[PDB]
Structures are given as C-alpha cells and as structure tokens.
Design a protein around this ligand. Sequence first.
Ligand SMILES: OC[C@H]1O[C@H](O[C@@H]2[C@@H](O)[C@@H](O)O[C@H](CO)[C@@H]2O)[C@H](O)[C@@H](O)[C@H]1O
Ligand SMILES: OC[C@H]1O[C@H](O[C@@H]2[C@@H](O)[C@@H](O)O[C@H](CO)[C@@H]2O)[C@H](O)[C@@H](O)[C@H]1O
Ligand SMILES: OC[C@H]1O[C@H](O[C@@H]2[C@@H](O)[C@@H](O)O[C@H](CO)[C@@H]2O)[C@H](O)[C@@H](O)[C@H]1O
Ligand SMILES: OC[C@H]1O[C@H](O[C@@H]2[C@@H](O)[C@H](O)O[C@H](CO)[C@@H]2O)[C@H](O)[C@@H](O)[C@H]1O
Ligand SMILES: OC[C@H]1O[C@H](O[C@@H]2[C@@H](O)[C@H](O)O[C@H](CO)[C@@H]2O)[C@H](O)[C@@H](O)[C@H]1O
Lengths: 721, 228, 721
Amino acid sequence: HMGVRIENNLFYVESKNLSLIIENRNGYLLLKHLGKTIKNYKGSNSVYERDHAFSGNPTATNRTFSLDTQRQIFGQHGLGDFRKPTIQVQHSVTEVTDFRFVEAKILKGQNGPQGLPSPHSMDDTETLVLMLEDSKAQLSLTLYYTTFNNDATIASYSKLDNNSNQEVVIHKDFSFMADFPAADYEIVTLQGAYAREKTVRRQQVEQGIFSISSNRGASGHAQTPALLLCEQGVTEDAGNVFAIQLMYSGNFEAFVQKNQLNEVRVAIGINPENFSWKLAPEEYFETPVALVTHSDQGLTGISHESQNFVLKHIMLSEFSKKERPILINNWEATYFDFQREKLLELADEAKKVGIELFVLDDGWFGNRFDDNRALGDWVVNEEKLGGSLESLISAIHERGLQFGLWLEPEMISVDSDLYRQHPDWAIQVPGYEHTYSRNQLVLNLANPQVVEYLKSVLDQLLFYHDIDYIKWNMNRNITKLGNGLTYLETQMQSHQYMLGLYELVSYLTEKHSHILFESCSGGGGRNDLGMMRYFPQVWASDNTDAIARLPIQYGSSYLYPTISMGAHVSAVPNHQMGRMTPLETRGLVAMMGNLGYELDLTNLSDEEKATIANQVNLYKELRPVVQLGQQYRLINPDTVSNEAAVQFNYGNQTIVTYVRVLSVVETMETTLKLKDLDEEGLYKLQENGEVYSGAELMYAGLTVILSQGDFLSRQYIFRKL
Amino acid sequence: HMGVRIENNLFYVESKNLSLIIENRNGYLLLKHLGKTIKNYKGSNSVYERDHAFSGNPTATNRTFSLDTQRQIFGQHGLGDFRKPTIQVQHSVTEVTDFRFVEAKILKGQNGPQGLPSPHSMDDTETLVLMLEDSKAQLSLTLYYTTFNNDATIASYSKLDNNSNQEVVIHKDFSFMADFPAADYEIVTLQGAYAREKTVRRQQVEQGIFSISSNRGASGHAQTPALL
Amino acid sequence: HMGVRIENNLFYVESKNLSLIIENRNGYLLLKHLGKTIKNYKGSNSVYERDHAFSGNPTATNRTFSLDTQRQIFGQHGLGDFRKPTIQVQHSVTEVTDFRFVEAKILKGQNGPQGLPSPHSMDDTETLVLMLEDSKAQLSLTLYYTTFNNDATIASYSKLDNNSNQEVVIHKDFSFMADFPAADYEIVTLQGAYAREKTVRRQQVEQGIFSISSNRGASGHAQTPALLLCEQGVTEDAGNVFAIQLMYSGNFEAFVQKNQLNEVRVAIGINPENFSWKLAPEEYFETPVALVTHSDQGLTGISHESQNFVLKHIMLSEFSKKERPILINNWEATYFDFQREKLLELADEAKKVGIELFVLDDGWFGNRFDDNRALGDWVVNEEKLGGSLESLISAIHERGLQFGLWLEPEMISVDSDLYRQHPDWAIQVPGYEHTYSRNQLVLNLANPQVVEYLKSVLDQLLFYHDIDYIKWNMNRNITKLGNGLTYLETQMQSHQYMLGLYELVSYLTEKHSHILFESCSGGGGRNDLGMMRYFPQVWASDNTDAIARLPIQYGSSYLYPTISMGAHVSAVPNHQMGRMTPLETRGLVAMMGNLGYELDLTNLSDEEKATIANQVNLYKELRPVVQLGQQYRLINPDTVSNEAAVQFNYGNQTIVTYVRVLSVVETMETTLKLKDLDEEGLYKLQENGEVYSGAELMYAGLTVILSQGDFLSRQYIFRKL
Ligand SMILES: OC[C@H]1O[C@H](O[C@@H]2[C@@H](O)[C@@H](O)O[C@H](CO)[C@@H]2O)[C@H](O)[C@@H](O)[C@H]1O
Ligand SMILES: OC[C@H]1O[C@H](O[C@@H]2[C@@H](O)[C@@H](O)O[C@H](CO)[C@@H]2O)[C@H](O)[C@@H](O)[C@H]1O
Ligand SMILES: OC[C@H]1O[C@H](O[C@@H]2[C@@H](O)[C@@H](O)O[C@H](CO)[C@@H]2O)[C@H](O)[C@@H](O)[C@H]1O
Ligand SMILES: OC[C@H]1O[C@H](O[C@@H]2[C@@H](O)[C@H](O)O[C@H](CO)[C@@H]2O)[C@H](O)[C@@H](O)[C@H]1O
Ligand SMILES: OC[C@H]1O[C@H](O[C@@H]2[C@@H](O)[C@H](O)O[C@H](CO)[C@@H]2O)[C@H](O)[C@@H](O)[C@H]1O
C-alpha cells in the first residue's frame, strides 16, 4: 500500500518503492529513513545519542540530544545545529526561529504552491501536512510531502505564514533537505556551458560544502537544478541513487555538505543570493516544488525513474505521449536576411522532403534586421513578410506544413518603440547605466503592468493567427536589480519575475492548448522542470554540431525524456565548431533526439535533398521508438571516451545508434552489448536479415565495424519476431 | 627590488619571489599576474577578449569586454560578472555598486585595519593603496596590498567608506580574491573535527563551488581559515 | 538443457548459466563465446577479419585470416600468433607444432587426468572431447571440456600423445586459455605472504603481460592458483566475473596478456619454469584440471559460485557437509617442550570447556626436541609420551576427546636416522652443498622408493593407532633440483614430485576415509584446490592474531568455503604480531572460520576458562550457520578500511560479526546493512529482543555502536520467525 500513514510518533510517506519515514520527537522532526519501502519500522539505523563536543542542546541537563547531530528534514540556524540552514526568517531583532511540530494532516489528490509549476495527474496521491509553529515569533511553517503511486518519487514544498503583528523577512527557504548517514558517497550533477549544456559531472563527496547555483535570474546553461547522491561505486546498471530536483526556472542552489562527523546534508531550493521575501501580517510564502526520486538500478535506473515521472506528472498531458512534428527552422539558414520569396521556397523544399512544420525564427517583427533593436515591438513586419502574417501562414498551410513562430517576450531593446514609450519597464537601477547583453535589456516581469501588456499583445497574436507552434526565447541573464520602491522589494523582484513569467506562460499555454510551445534560452540556458511544466520540448543547445551534440544529448536526456530534446540537422562546416561531419552522422545524432532541420534546403544539391528525404522517411518510422520508447545508454560520450551509443526499445522495435569520434587504426573493433531484451526473444536485424536471440545480443553483443575516418556512425534496427 | 611600483596602467606589488601585477583598464582592475617575480610585464597571458554568450557588457556596442570573463581582484554582482562576489553593499533600493578605480597611493612601513590582528615588524614593507569610488552611491572602497621583503607573502585588506547622506549596509566583504587562469588545480585544506583537528584534505578542483566555512562565531575545530 | 552439443561447425559446452561455444574453422578452433547461456548462436560478436600489419597467415593469398588476431582456446607459437603460447612441444629440430582439429566426441559421467586431483560427483556431467593432430610431428593433443548441471563452472584439461617413432619434449602445457574481446577489464588475485596469506589484490588490465606464478615446488604463500577477469567497475553485488583456477599444488602460472590490438588472453597451468616433460613413443601427458567459473552478480556472486563448486565437486563428500570438531592444538601452547603429564592436563582443561578434539603437534617422534633434527624418523618417542602412543590415545579417548596427530612426511633432516640410511633420498644436486630451510631438506617424492616408504610407514601408523585426525605439514620450498639421471629427468622431477604426493595422499585419505586430514604448509603455503581434493580443511595461517587474521580470512574464504578455513583462538600478547587483543575479539574472529584453540589452557585464569567455555557453547550453536551456511561480506578488511564485517545465512538463522581495528573519536557510527533476507521476513535480534523486517535490516541497516578502544568486536544474532 502507498500513500501517507501516521502511526504513533512516526509518519510514513509511501510512494512506489520509496518511503520517507519521519519521527516526531517532542516537537523536533527526525529523518529516520529515506529509501526503499519499510513497513513496521523499528529504528535499526537510529542515531546513537551521545555527547558530541561543541554540539549544544535545547536543555541544560541533557548533553546527548543535539540538533547538531540529529538527522532532520529541515535546517535552522541558532539552536545548536551548525549545518547549512534551509529556513531562516528575520523577525524583530533576530533571525532565530524555533519551529516545533504541532499537528499533522493528510490530503488526497491535487495540491501544490499557488503561482508555481507543480505536478499534475495527482488523483492517486496523498500529501502529508506537517504543521510547525514558532509560538514566540507567531510564525507557522507547514511542510508538504506528496506520494505517487506509479513512480519512486516524493514531492515537497513548504508554506510560511506570518501570524504576527509585524513585518517579517524570509532570508532562506529551500524546497527539500535530507540528512543522510555517514557513508561513502559520490554526486552526479549536470553543469557545462553555453554550447556545452548539461555536461555530466561526477565526483566524490568530500568534507566541506559543494554547491551548484544560479544567480542569473534563470537556471542557466552551466548548472541544472538537480543533484544525484549516489552509493559509492554506482554504475549505469547497479547501485542506489537519490535524485533531488527543483521545478523552478530562476535562481536556485543545490548543495551537499559533509560535516565534522562525516554526516551528509543535501538540499535544493531558491538561491539565498538575490532573495529576500517580506511578509506583512497574515501574508504567506510558498516555495517551489522539489522532487526526491530513487533507484537501486544505477544511473540508468534513475534516468528511467526521472523520465517517467516527468512524462506522467510534469510534461503537459496533451503532448507527453504525442509524436512531435519534424520541423524546418530558418535561423541558421538565413539569419535575419530573409523575405517572403525565400521563405516559401524553403517551405517548398521542406515539403518535398516530407518535413511537417515550418518555423519562422527571429527577424519577422518591428525593424528587427539585426540583433541590436526591436525587441519588445511584436508588430508584424509586413514589408519583410511581403504582406500580412495571416497571408504568410495561409501560404505555409496551403503547402501542407504546420506554421511556427519565434518570440522573445521577456526582453526589450533600447532601440524599440516599447523602450521609447516605457523605459522604466526594463530591469535597472536608478542612476546606473544599463548593463547590456546581446545589446538588449530584460523586461521587469515583477511589474504587473509588464505582465498584463505581454498577456494582451500575445493573446492578440495567437487568437488572430493560425499558429501551430511557438518557440519562446530568452537570450540574456539579469543584471542591475533596483526596480523596487525599497531594498526589500528589489530583493523580491527576481522571484516575482519568475512568478510573473509563470502567470504569463501558464495563461497562454492553457488558453492556447493546441499550440506546441518549445522553450529556448540561447539553446539550453533554462532547460529545467519548471519550464517543462508548460513547454513540452526545449531547444537543447545552439550547438548543432553532430559530434559536439553527443555529450549535450547525454546530459539533456539524463533526467528529462528524449521527447523534450530538440535536435536539428544543420549545415557544414558547422557554424559553432567550424567542423565537417557526414550528413549521415548529423542525421543519426539528431535522430537520438526530437528531430528537426535547420539549414538552407534551397542551397543543397539534389543528392543532399534525397538524403534528407530518406532521413525524414526513416525517422517517421523511428519517431515512436525514440520519442515514446525506453532509452538505454550503452557507451557514454565523455571527456575520455572516443565513442557514443544509445539504444531505444519500444514494443517489438529495438534500435541502436553508434558514433565514433576520431578514426582509429590497429585497434580491435568494439563489442557493443544491448540491454533489456528477452533472452529467448528472436531479433531480426534489418540490415543483414539475420535473427539473433536476445541472449546473444545482450551477452555476446555486436562487433562494431567502421571504415577509416572521423565522425562516422551507424544504426542497427531490430524487429522482435 | 621589492616594494610597490606604479608604471603607466600597471601596479606591481613585489614581495620576495612573489608579485601581484594589476592593470587599470578604464577604472576596472584586472589581475594580470600573481606568482613568481616578473619585471617589465608585457601581457603574454592576457585574457583574450571575445564575445562569450550570456556574458554581458558595460557598454552596448562592445560585446567582447565583460566582467564575466576578465580576471579580477575583487568581485561585484550585477554588472555582468556572475561569479561569487566579494563586495556587496546595500544602499537605497539596491545592492548594486560599481566601484571604479580613481587614484593609487603607496605607503611605507606599518599599517593595518584598526581593531583587528595584523602583521608586525613592517619597517621594510610598502603598501599599494587602490582608491575606488562609486560616484552614484557616494561610497569609497580602498584596497590595500602590502609587500614583505623577506617572505613570499602579500597581505591584503580593504576599507569601505560611506560618504553618502544615508545609512548603507555591507552584506559581503571578503579580505582577498584572485581569478586564476583555467588549468588543472588541486586544493589542500585543513578540516577535521574536535579531537581530530586540522585533518589535511586534498581534492581536485571541479566545476561548481567548493567551500569551507564557520558559522560558529569561532573559526572552529572542523575548518581552518586557509585554502591552498 | 545442459551438457555438450555438436551442431555443424559449432560445439556448445553448456553448464548451468555458463556456455563455451567453439567453432571449427578448417581445423582451427575459435572461441566464439564464453559467458551466459546462448542457444542458436549466430556470431554477432565474431572477429572482423582484416589485414592487420605484421599479423601473418597460413596461406599466401589470404591476408585477413591470422592466428595473431583470431580468438582461440589454446595457443601455439610459430604459426603467426605471437601471444604467449600454452602448448609447445619439441620434436626433431623444432618446437613448432600445428595441431588441427580432426574429430569430436562426447563423454558422459566421470573422467579426468590419471594421477591428478579432479572433480568428483560427475554423474550429471558431459565432456566435450576435441581431438587435434599434427600429422607431420605425429602428435595428438586432445582437449576436454566438462559441463556441470548445478554450477556455473566448466572444467578443462588436455592430453598429449606421442605417436611418433622418436622422443619428444613438452616445454609448455597449460590447462586452460581464453581470448576475450578488447574491453576494459580489471583483475582480482590472491597473493600476500607468509603470515599475510591470500591478500586480495585488484588492478586494471594494462598493455603487456601480468602474471602470478610459483617456482617453489608448492603453490606458495604469496600466490594462489586463481585469476578473476572482471568487467570494469565490478562490485561485491554487481558485474561479470570469470574466475580461472587450477587443481594443482606445485609450480603454476596464471597470466593475463593485453596485446597490440587491445585483445586479452588469460591462461592458467603448470609453470613453464622448472618444467619439461619427455614422452617416449606411445607415451602421453595429461595436464591438471583447470576450472572456469562465471557470475554476473559481482564478487560475492563469484565467491558463491566458486565455494559451491568446491563443496559439491572437489571437497570430499565425507566431510563437505560435516560439522568439523572444535579442537585444541598444543603447538603455540608448549612448542617442543611437553610430556605426558602436560598433555593430559591440557586435555583435562580442553574437556572442561567442551572442546571436542585434541591435536598433538610437532615434537612427538624421533628425537624431535627442536626443529633441527628428526624429520623422516616417524618413530614414537615413548619416553616423551610417557608410554606408547596407543596408551596416550586411549587416555585422550577416555577423557571424551577425539585424537589428532601432526606429520610432515615430505621432509627429512640431515640429523635423522632416515638421512643416515638414505642421504640420496633428499632433493639435491651432485657436487653441491644442500640449501637449508628451517634446517631441513625435502624428500624426493619423484623417487618411487620414497613414495613406497611413506605409504608403508604411514599406513602402519594409521592402522595400529586409533587416530581421528591428521595435520599434514610442509615447512619449506624446493631447492637444488638435480636428482635426475639426465637433465630432462631433473626437469620432470618437480611435477613427478607432485604426482608422487597425490599418489600418497589419495591412497591414505581413501584407505583411512574416517580420518579428517587438515593440510598445512607453515599455515597457508599450499592452500589450493589440488590439496582441497583430499584435505577438507587447511591451517589458513600461522598468524593467529585476531586483527591480522581479518585480511587473511577475507582472502582464504574468497574462493574456498569457510568450512575449510582453520582458525584458532591463541594467547596474548600474540606470538606473531606482539599485540594484545580482547579475548572476545579473538573468539569472534576465529568463529568466522573453522574454530579451534591453540594456547595453554592450563595457564589461564578461572575467568578466561569460563569465557572460552562460553565461546565453545556459542560456536556449537553457530557452527552449522558458519560452516554450512551462505557467506556475505559486508565490510571488507583491506589496506584502507578500519573495519571488517561478515554475515552468514542458514535457514532461519542470520548472524553478523563486526570488528573495528583502531579506536575512533568524533566519528558518526557506521550503518551496516544486511543482505539476502526476505523483505517481508521478521527477524528477531537476540540481544535486544526487537523484531525487524528484512527490508529494515537490508535497506536501513544497523547503527553499529562501540565503546572506546582498539580491536573491539560485536556479533548480531537474528532468528527469522
Ligand atoms: O495551512 C497551514 C496554515 O493555515 C492557516 O492559514 C491559511 C493560509 O496559509 C492560506 O492557506 O490561506 C488560508 C485561507 O483561509 C488560511 O488562512 C494558518 O493561519 C497558518 O497558521 C497555517 O496553519
Ligand atoms: O583612505 C581612503 C578614504 O579616505 C577618506 O576617509 C578617511 C576615513 O576612511 C578614515 O581613515 O578616517 C580618516 C580620518 O581623516 C579619513 O576621513 C575619504 O573620505 C574616503 O572617501 C576614502 O578616500
Ligand atoms: O584419447 C585420445 C588419444 O587416443 C589414443 O590413445 C590412447 C592414449 O591416449 C591412452 O588413453 O591410452 C589409451 C589406451 O588404449 C589409448 O591408446 C590415440 O593413440 C591418440 O592419438 C589420441 O587420439
Ligand atoms: O536570434 C535568434 C536566435 O536566438 C537564440 O540564439 C542566439 C544566438 O544565435 C546568438 O549567437 O547568441 C545569442 C546569445 O548571445 C543567442 O544564443 C536561439 O537559441 C537561436 O535558436 C535563434 O533563435
Ligand atoms: O613445527 C610445528 C609448526 O609447523 C608449522 O609452522 C612453522 C612455524 O612454527 C615456524 O616458526 O616456522 C616454520 C617455517 O619457518 C613453520 O611455518 C605449522 O604451520 C605450525 O602450525 C606448527 O605445526
């Protein structure tokens, strides 16, 4: 049985194959167990209470009880625990609180923080409600833990109520924390950089504090809101992993602290940097949702658990199991230099090769002839489009293609009518020059007038035009915070910006629910689970190099389903890397993702056109396997590997893609073994017609043969008989 | 020769076998070299200035100058550098400052922060005084770097003056910072515990942030104020 | 289905969950697969045949077939393969052979090399017989591979027949070889030293050749005839392991070679060093049996597979499931300084504490008052024993104890009547002084007169005396080889020594099958599967320190069952380490093995006596769990670990022993999780009466609490309800 149970002083939060067991000890909440299901928990792994030097106590006479040494589910500073705190509220002359458990409730079905992205499809869930109070400060903190009956994930968030007669200020308020017992641990995170997104990083947990964080106002290219605490020696196939993740797209921190006793604290939430939150009497603050996910089946186990939870409970139901259109995007194809003739000719070529959707990228609005002006001016450039957008769309529709359109609503150019009319709408500090980034500024979405304006302009665009798809961009990070009437309002504006964004995108995605919205932030600059609540695919990276895409796709699909992961076949030499790669390899690499095209089809040879038509035909066949199937990493593209290989299973279809980076000589061929087949199953390999048992493919494997050369690839396609 | 030298837009802080060479670039202070003595420094290891995506700029038209990518000796938040800041002062409705170099002085002999433990036997020392101002906020930040003639050590501290007509609040103010060029590095620290003090720890520098800290009101058994 | 199958040009050798699939390619035998079961093998992992530079060919015109690049099951030198060979026979002017497959047969039921220890209980086995011939040299090589229906092990050996009209000389003849595909591999071996036996070593496979070997004439303290080739990243719980082992107790080699293409060869057999073997026309040579064992369940998987195979098919049926007596041995207790009074008084004390068997150690024979004389003179010293051995034995029997006796049959002292009568019986070289070791010499057991003499003297000792147990010692290694009438006979004498030993011990153990024979060689100097065919327990180490015993027991039980592993509680300060350890810890450590006692019980306090009586009572209870149960390593004692923990399961009994080496301070308690329990099972912990689900014990685990101090231990005893 799954759900929530209250049994004497234990609370059991029971998801599928994952339990959190909390003990109420005289108002203090102790983490007894987080991990595989245990019923009738007795306490075999309880903390041994002893006098630990310099670890102090809530009472004078009992030296062996200390919040410095108890395992907890939230952290305070000032009561004897010196580990990093996760709740810290200023009230009167102090930022000491002492929240004590008073009452527990259980909810059933949907719930979550208002104004923030949270799980859906929650009918078969229960939520533990732990009501804590600080009687002196007259504050309440309420913790929520939600079970899921179909996934090894628990969701968490909290609400802080000010029940006092004075203003209070939240300084720290994370979404999840767990104290894990001293043991050897490794951590996996996804970091990297622009054009190197979601680089998989693994390291040993060491004494001290390790953290990843964004202070950019977006989660960022260089860190993902995820931290995987792993059993020493974890592999793809074996060992315990706990993934903590955050459904938030602004400033966040994830940290792991190893203290003086070798104990380990992990937490994730809103970054303390650039954050404070004023609460007037009777006001409350709810944190974004955190997730804790578990597998005992290594890193592939955690990928599957995380992907499944995302597909079922985050990504929009309307799209989570819907094959996504193969698109053409004109950006790398033309940049800003296009007009109607060029567009329809590209559309003609796209239709001939069987592409499904035509996306008009940057440059269609205002006087956007380059990237130095016009953001904020969402007026159609009818001169450039050679008539109305309506007439363009009709043209695209009549050629048999869906129509998509680029927006960047959060941004404003100094050189724009919007800025001329409302210069105060930009994020800025009185008496300081702007800081520029791609020669543009960020709109203050903490300003309700800004949100109202964007809802209006965009609702107008979407209702008056037959648009099938939106690409929602965001091309710089936030500087010069000073739009508040007070310092505290400025400290709130980064989170209020996010609330404004979510109000905006939840409104539009809900009001226009037939439209496929793809998120973007110079590629993967905001590829997190907050955005994926509303945008069921993401432009994974501006780097469209087939080879540079290998580690990027590795990371981008590590916790997120492949279906989310936009990938385009682009021109050579590649625009980012300056590299020639075979068209075959560009195709096979993009086909490990959500396939599209981004090159000038009108300038290709007849042969290159035929190749792309063949690629499109192939992917129409593989699309369900890739987008709806189960992903298995076989060879990981990292810093030292010269190879990449990824398998997908879906019913009677099994495919495997193999890529080799550098040509090798006098080196024995790799043996590549498949996973998760029926030993007794019979698998017919398309290329040679041979039938192999699943046992053979899994335990003997394929001798991988290639010619001489860099960046070569091949694909194996099997049908189970 | 050891001591402090000011030469066009370079400042040389020269201790025995250790130099800090700082460049004034239009009010921004750049760390050019920290390490073994170099005279007549030309800039072989200067940062190559290019357009780095999402690294923003103090002017609209120059995309290749960014405090996100320049090596510095103190860190601010809000001007395009997103690395962890080491000075952050709230004033009026903001905690954005933009301290710009205005003037350099050189002291000889003893000096240090009042009320805090500082080096003694300083007769053969010189101190570089880098006076920075935020004209809008009406704040001064003054950086001090002191040479020693008999040791490969440089000492540092700073003073922040409120020259405005309103209260201001310091939120962050570290004593030393250096941006080192991308390379492979390890770190050594002394941590441990009560009855296990100053345990020597060594690890690889990894992407992200590693820290040791005390919030105990004392430096503590489990971490020493040192990082190698 | 298991057994052997011949299907066109494939041969399938099918044990439980392990298959060897060999292809006959025009007389050459190719290793197609060794690993998990595959039926209907097609060849997905076949070698890709290409022209590899400097890899030559059996025909002029086909450059892509080369024995330098094909994966094989035996290795020759001179036909284009430059990997280390495993068969090399001199004939006429050459040591080039070219053995070609001619015919295959299948046997059922028992078979093995004559004169060498081989598996028993073989009714449900089949043996593939691969008959190879070199027509020019007129030699036959016949390879045997045997399946087992109840274990993931295949056994192998070969026979070489000289069918020519001239003498031939074998230079190399290993017992097993496999070419494994290029991949990342680690190897585990057991090495160490005297008083540090079976130290577990793990390392990466590197280009070049790694080997362990003995040239000592015994397998030796410092290397065990075992090599585990492991999947990169193997753990206790997960990953593929292939263990190759040799049932031989003389000179051996195991090697792993990584060649120029990254391919990996492994082999084990008689060491080429100190070996040559002359065959006259019509003579044949059979190699010792090698074993290849597989698990995909990590290192605990391989331990279980290896232990099970040993228990079922090597260790004597009469003893493999028989609880072994708790003994007292007087060696550390008295050394050579004893007589009848002392012996019976020790026997009295042993009986009071419930000990079962009394073993009389060195010094009872000839004029053996120290270790400088009398080896070879197996005459009872009736003066020292205060009457006949018969009268001593009766005395011991009447006190309720079984009687055991020390022998060292393979050795002779210069100062002995045996040496005075037959100086030529010693291993020696004409015209060279002896090399001495513990001031004794080795008997030439290659001399049939020596074997006849020992059979006679010992048969006499055993038939005329009511002995329940023998401790068979061997206290030096072999030097000064030169007893041959020719150089070639000398080159044969080390292997003939072993044949002589096995003839001797198979005879006596068979003719006196009620007697428990424990093997010994200054502790673990010859603790291998050759000896374990006849001697169902072994003195694991002269090091009886509780703490030094930790890594020793780790290694000694790594591939061999716990029941084999002699372990004695001894006096403090310990005689080897100069160390004080708690009597409790000495007890608990020895109780992880086959328990006995080796200290002067007559000199203990009343309290120390009561403690030992308590230990004996406890072990009488734990003995089936330890000796007959399943072993699970929980914390391994290695160079860096400060801890050791080992679990045993047997029906409704689960025990766990924990030892900490150095005292620690301000360090959080270890969390120790149990393995292989029923999640839903209820487990009652004896010490506190608490009942824990198996899920709790396995997934939460025990907080391990100890006082301050070095070398402390504790045991947890559970009963499943
Ligand atoms: O749910 C826990 C809190 O409930 C009460 O306040 C809530 C408030 O948080 C918000 O949900 O608005 C509703 C509307 O009725 C309630 O006022 C308590 O005041 C808090 O102390 C806390 O228990
Ligand atoms: O030294 C740099 C600063 O100097 C001036 O102020 C100092 C003040 O810091 C303190 O040292 O007290 C002395 C006493 O005269 C001076 O007032 C400037 O006001 C600062 O702006 C700054 O330049
Ligand atoms: O079993 C393979 C060999 O069989 C023949 O010789 C055997 C010999 O090895 C030994 O087993 O003694 C028996 C007794 O009859 C046989 O002679 C062949 O001579 C060998 O060539 C080889 O086939
Ligand atoms: O402007 C259209 C373009 O926007 C985003 O990419 C850009 C990139 O082309 C430019 O070189 O740099 C900025 C940041 O400096 C952005 O990363 C989209 O990601 C891209 O797909 C395209 O739509
Ligand atoms: O002599 C009896 C003794 O023989 C073996 O051990 C000895 C050891 O006591 C002595 O110190 O060294 C030699 C080698 O130099 C042997 O290792 C047995 O192993 C021991 O149990 C005892 O029976």
